Amino acid sequence: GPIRKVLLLKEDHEGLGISITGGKEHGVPILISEIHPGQPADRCGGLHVGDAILAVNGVNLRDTKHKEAVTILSQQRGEIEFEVVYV
């Protein structure tokens, strides 16, 4: 589908509220495999299971390994912009 821009708001005491799978070393994008109920990704309304995360806060994720993506994603704080696409 279309590439979309999505805003997520979170406080410092929370995680993002997602599970991810995939990564470059597996030949798979960074994919959302879970949205956890009531946590910031669920509350922002625009992120869904099956979405590929293309970038976060302008940091490209298309060619990142799994653990690289985890470090990058877990470093972001507050008002966070995602670039995602559902295939």
């Binding site: 997602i18 799978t21 990564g23 956890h36």
Partner: peptide, 7 residues
Amino acid sequence: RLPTSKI
């Protein structure tokens, strides 16, 4: 087979 991480 693919890893999953909660974040």
